[PDB]
Amino acid sequence: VSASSKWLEGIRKWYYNAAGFNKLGLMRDDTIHENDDVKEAIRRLPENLYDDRVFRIKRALDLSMRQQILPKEQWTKYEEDKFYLEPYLKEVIRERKEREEWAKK
Amino acid sequence: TATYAQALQSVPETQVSQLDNGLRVASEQSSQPTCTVGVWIDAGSRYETEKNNGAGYFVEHLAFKGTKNRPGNALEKEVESMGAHLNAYSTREHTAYYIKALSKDLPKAVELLADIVQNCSLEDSQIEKERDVILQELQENDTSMRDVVFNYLHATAFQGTPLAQSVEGPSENVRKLSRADLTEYLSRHYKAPRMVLAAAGGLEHRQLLDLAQKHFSGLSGTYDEDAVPTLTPCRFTGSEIRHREDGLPLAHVAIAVEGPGWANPDNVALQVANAIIGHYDCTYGGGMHLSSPLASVAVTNKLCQSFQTFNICYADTGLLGAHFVCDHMSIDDMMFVLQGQWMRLCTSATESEVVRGKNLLRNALVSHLDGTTPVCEDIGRSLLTYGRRIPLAEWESRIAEVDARVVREVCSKYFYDQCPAVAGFGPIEQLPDYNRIRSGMFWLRF
Amino acid sequence: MLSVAARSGPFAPVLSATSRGVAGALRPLVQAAVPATSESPVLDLKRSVLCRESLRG
Amino acid sequence: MLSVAARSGPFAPVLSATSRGVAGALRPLVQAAVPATSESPVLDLKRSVLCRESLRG
Amino acid sequence: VPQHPQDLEFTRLPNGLVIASLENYAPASRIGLFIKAGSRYENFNNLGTSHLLRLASSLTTKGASSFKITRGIEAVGGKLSVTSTRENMAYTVECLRDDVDILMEFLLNVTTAPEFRRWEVAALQSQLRIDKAVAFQNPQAHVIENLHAAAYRNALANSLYCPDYRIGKVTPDELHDYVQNHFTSARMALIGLGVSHPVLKQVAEQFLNIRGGLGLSGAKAKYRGGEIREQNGDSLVHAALVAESAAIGSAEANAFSVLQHVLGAGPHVKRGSNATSSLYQAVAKGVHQPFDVSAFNASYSDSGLFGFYTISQAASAGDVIKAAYNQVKTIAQGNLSNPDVQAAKNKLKAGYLMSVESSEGFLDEVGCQALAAGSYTPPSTVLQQIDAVADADVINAAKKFVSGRKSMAASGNLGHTPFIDEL
Amino acid sequence: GLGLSGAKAKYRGGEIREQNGDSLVHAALVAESAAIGSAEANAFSVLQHVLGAGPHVKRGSNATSSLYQAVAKGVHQPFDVSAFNASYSDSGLFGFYTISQAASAGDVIKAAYNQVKTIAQGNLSNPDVQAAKNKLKAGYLMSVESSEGFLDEVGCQALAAGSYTPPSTVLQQIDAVADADVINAAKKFVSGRKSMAASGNLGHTPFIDEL
């Protein structure tokens, strides 16, 4: 979430200071629109992770209703964000690429 | 190497012969130090007629019951003391009796076979007692309820109609068992010319003819007289019934659609077709990856507790299809599976599977050819029905000739728009009507 | 010179996905089939058995 | 002159509908409460215990 | 005529891996891998992980997708199963010789390439419970197998199933470890049937290196002899009373096999009085109703016992089992014929025959050669060793069986049965 | 009514053996005692007190018994052993219910038997005997006691006594406490086939044949 990505992923950082996500402290991965692949993707998610994304999500709802945001300090640390799913997810990308693959076969 | 066909040639050649009755003796001479000595006891499950009911099952219970040339414990002495093998595997028109032996021993049981062939006795002691062991052992011995399942597929889903006729026959008959069924109808049935002189193991076919003359000769010589009709075609039952059981805890379900029998040239691909069909094993794992798409959804949907393609046999017709197991649910979609798969089948052919089940029939093809007794009986019905043996490259020829055009078409030819067997066991409510289930026998998919 | 097998009717399981399971292992126990009222079942919450694939040349 | 009872911590059940069940019977086994991390549960697919009715004059 | 028919090539990899290419010119394909990973090598650190793995061939594989693997397996449509034994787990592929390499690759994969995926594993768990269901299922899976579970006692009874208390608890740590702990060139036996000793050597070489086995035969697996006692309420009682025999490879082992034949087992010809044994003939003279008794072989290299699996209705269990022991005593009398001995050698030796035999029960018997023999002491030499049959040690043996602490095994209520202390 | 006391209910002594996977192991090792109404019955009750059981005052080292004091000296962690009374008129056994983590089960249970052996040494005090009579006799006291554990104790009178050999007479019969038969008894317990009982895996535990 840093200057190129604070301009660009600073649509998610400076301009999600504007578009909100990361300054809202969101989870990058969490932003993926729910899809089936996304669905079972999460089904396979890691546990401690699952809790984490949970608290994140709920909180997001919380301030959302509150229509407030955390301290800009509390606003999320830029860059410095594990790509949570992306190993798991992207793995699934290969999966549905595989079901998709022999499927093509 | 010399490829599966030139391996098929490279697989050595069996031979056959005709003894002078017109007597039939065929030989696979092998390295088998023991051997399956088929004295192929050719009295089968369906071979019999109406009031003849049970006499072959009794005969089965009578088969080893003891005799004169060898008494019962004596049969057990030469035989059992020999430590030899005997079975009776009863089929539509024929059956077999194995002898596992030192090929060294080859003459001995042949001798035994002969008295088997002949000296089997109806002993008013046995006929009282062993036939109190028949009256009893048989009498209550019936009740096998997978034979009320699989032989609900045979004793029910195969009807009992004169051609559909069941095996065991009446308990009224069980009372009514007769020496006229044995004194007479053993003789009045048992007729050697049809009996099979069956050679499996290491062996000498010349010696086969030899000992044949020595003991096995003088069999069909007395034969014929009257009563040898053919099969007048008709319709098997065509129905369904639930033995209606709240007590049936979970469906042992099933279905089938033509299974092999003796005759028709079609079943070749139907074999392959049944291959495309396939049997979805409960104990089988891997459903996520399962091949039969049916099987697949069945996993995903957890859509049933079993299905197994099961080929029910009559010369030129039958039913080959899934056993099954399920709760209050499956059956409906099952046919949506099954018939629909059939529908899918009747339409959807892709050469891939064709090649697959080709390899199925190839591997399996071994697994029958492969094995000593499987090859044995394989010879037995091979000439019994065929009179020929589909050679390795003959069966691999029509096999080799396999054609997926005939899949679409021939599929339509046999398969389309019919009413084959389906039998669950238990509370069948998911069984729709013939006006539904067998409306499902028709396709609005088009 | 290394030996595992054959004494007929005991249990050392054999199972697969493609196949089904079974154990026929060394030692007996198969002799029970004799009596009258030879009965036998199907239709209630069970498994069954017996499949195979075998054909031809 | 006929005796059933008392040795504290074994089991000879006592149960009813109006009441609940228990067995406190003759012999011990109750001594286990000692250690640190004295923990203890509730909240998952269980039963619990301990009721009674007692009041006054 | 084959160029003079190929003698199966027995070898050991110089690495200390069992390197076996049995050249088979036969048309089909038979591929064994014998694994010390059979139950012997198993350990109390884990439970049913062999039951598991026995299922878990299908599991998510390193470098191979259990779905893609399933595509190749599913593709050729051949026979691949690893076999569950106390001694071995055996990776088996019988198929068209072509895909063998792929199969081999698959084999190479199957053996060497587990991914043990957490997710996948977790899924796999339930199918086990299914498995144990099959295990205990029916008078075969119940009265034979669950009453194997109710028969088999020691770490051999460490189940083709898993433990209940252990249920669901498997760990992928226990996976990579378990094989890493268990799987090894110590467990390595590769057996070709139908292939090129050179080619099998080729993949074998470029592939197969491993090592790493472990220790011991058991507690003397704790010799309780005695009852594994099971209240059943079996309707018709299923009780099985356990004599003992001898260790695998023991000098007397074969002799034990004799005594087996002496009391014998299920007949090669069906429907008979069981006329052949003081356990049977004198169960015939002795017993009037459903009964069975037979001797096992639980063959460690270290130890062994041949029981009697038994079958009968409750009422006669004291009667029968006592008579059992009685006949045993009667038998141990040393009274025997010569035709007893010889005609035995016919019966049981023939045991080795069909026991050795044919294309499947070749691959299972001559594949209990193509796995489970290791050479031919031929029907020449092993049936010479079998011809080395000698009776007296069956007499002193009759004493020996009479001499030990052996087991009893209970399925039912003993109200008519003996408890073997009251014996 | 009808007949009999049991098989001698079949005296397997020995293990009821239970694989548990109990986490912290629950194993209980069974000595024996004596029959209901037996002359020595009371004496068995002594031996009970000798090894004792759960304290009337909570939170203590279990300082009171070679089963306990020498589980105290003996054992460093969670443990329990105590004697039952399975009192037929015909027969009886007082085991030791046991509690401990797996690792020490051989260690403890053996020590158990060891202490048992140690105990069976006959070494005893007089204040052992008397102060016992205080402890266990008091056992009969609260054991007899009050309106509920009256109805359950004096209702184990109002059912389960049958008369008062009073705290006079039954505690006279209790005062009939005599030590030596607890020595010869120590032998007697040492002398029988008794039971072991298993909850866990014995990987650290003894199997009592390997005892």
**Contact assignment for B283 to C15 by CB distance below 8 Å:** yes
Closest residue by Cα to residue F103 from F208, F211, F206, F209 = F206
Q: Where are the alpha helices (DSSP H) in chain A?
A: 3-7, 15-18, 36-43, 47-66, 85-104
Whether F10 and E224 lie within 8 Å, measured CB to CB: no
In whole angstroms, what is the distance from residue D51 CA to residue B358 CA?
72
| Secondary structure (DSSP) of F34-64 | --TT-TTHHHHHHHHHHH--S-SSSS---TT
The CA distance from C38 to C43, in Å, is 17
The whole-angstrom separation of Cα B261 and Cα B269 is: 14
What region does B9 belong to: left with phi over 0, alpha with psi -120 to 50, or beta?
alpha
Residue the block writes with tokens 């009441």: D19
**Chain F contacts of E221, Cβ < 8 Å?**
none
Whether E141 contacts chain B with CB within 8 A: no
User: Which residues in chain E (211-230) have CB-CB distances under 8 A to chain F?
Assistant: 219, 222-224
C-alpha distance from residue C24 to each of B390, C14, E246, E360, E361 (Å): 33, 8, 21, 14, 12
Rounded Cα gap, residues B412 and B406, in angstroms: 9
**C-alpha to C-alpha distance for A29 and A20, rounded to whole angstroms:** 15
Q: Is F19 on the interface with E (CB under 8 A)?
A: yes
Q: How many Cβ atoms from other residues are within 10 Å of residue F209's Cβ?
A: 13
Q: Do D5 and F87 touch (CB under 8 A)?
A: no
Of B353, B349, B345, B356, residue with least CA distance to B321 = B345
Contacts of C23 in chain E (CB under 8 A): 84, 145, 148, 160
Q: CA B39 to CA B36: how far, in whole Å?
A: 9
Q: Per the structure block, which two tokens stand in for A24? A: 């809202």
Tokens in use for E238? 């299923």
| Residue showing tokens 């249970």 | F109
Are the C-beta atoms of residues F62 and F55 closer than 8 Å to each other? yes
Q: What is the CA radius of gyration of chain E?
A: 23
Q: Which residue of B has its CA nearest to E77?
A: B360
Tell me the residue length of chain B. 446
Task: Please report residues of E whose CB lies closer than 8 A to that of F21.
Answer: 163, 165-166
Q: Is F30:F194 a contact under the CB 8 Å cutoff?
A: yes
**Chains A & E: contacts with CB separation below 8 Å:** 9
Q: Where are the domains of chain D?
A: 1-57
Which residues of B does the annotation mark as catalytic?
A: 60
C22 Cα to chain B: minimum distance (Å): 10
Residues with Cβ < 8 Å from E370, sequence gap 6 or more? E8, E22, E24, E30, E32, E191, E193, E362, E363
Which residues in chain E have Cβ-Cβ distances shorter than 8 Å to A98? 65, 67-68
Q: At F132, list the tokens.
A: 């016992």
Q: Which residues pair with E132 in a beta bridge?
A: none
CA distance E230 to E178: 32
Tokens 């011991």, residue located: E216
Cβ pair E119:A44 closer than 8 A: yes
Structure tokens, B324: 């099954």
Coil, helix or strand for B366?
helix
CA-nearest of F162, A60, B70 to E269 is B70
Q: Tell me which chain E residue has its CA closest to the CA of residue F22.
A: E165
Alpha-carbon span E127 to E148, nearest angstrom: 21
Q: Distance (Å, rounded) from C-alpha C53 to C-alpha B310?
A: 11
DSSP category for residue F123: -
Phi-psi region of A96 (alpha: psi -120 to 50; beta: other; left: phi over 0): alpha
Distance CA B87, CA B85 (A): 7
Amino acid at B48: E
Residue A51, Cβ neighbours under 10 Å: how many?
A: 10
Give the CA-trace dihedral at B42, B43, B45, B48, to 10 degrees: 130
By Cβ distance, the residue of E165, E223, E422 closest to F21 is E165
Return d(Cα B126, Cα B133) in angstroms, integer. Answer: 8
Name which of B145, B367, B393 is nearest C43 (Cβ-Cβ): B145
Residues E95 and E27: their CA atoms lie apart, in Å, by 10
Q: How many CB atoms lie within 10 A of CB E301?
A: 12
User: How many C-beta atoms surround the C-beta of residue E309 within 10 A?
Assistant: 29
Helix-helix angle B351-369:B372-381, to 10 degrees: 100
Is residue B318 a contact partner of residue B312, using CB atoms and an 8 Å limit?
yes
For E245, phi then psi, to 5°, come to: -130, -80
Alpha helices, DSSP H, located in chain F: 41-51, 69-72, 105-120, 126-142, 147-151, 169-175, 180-191
Please list every residue in chain A whose beta carbon sits closer than 8 Å to the beta carbon of residue E67.
98-99, 102
Report CA E236 to chain centroid distance, whole Å: 27
Give the determination technique: cryo-EM
- Homologous superfamily, domain D1-57: Cytochrome Bc1 Complex; Chain I (2.10.210.10)
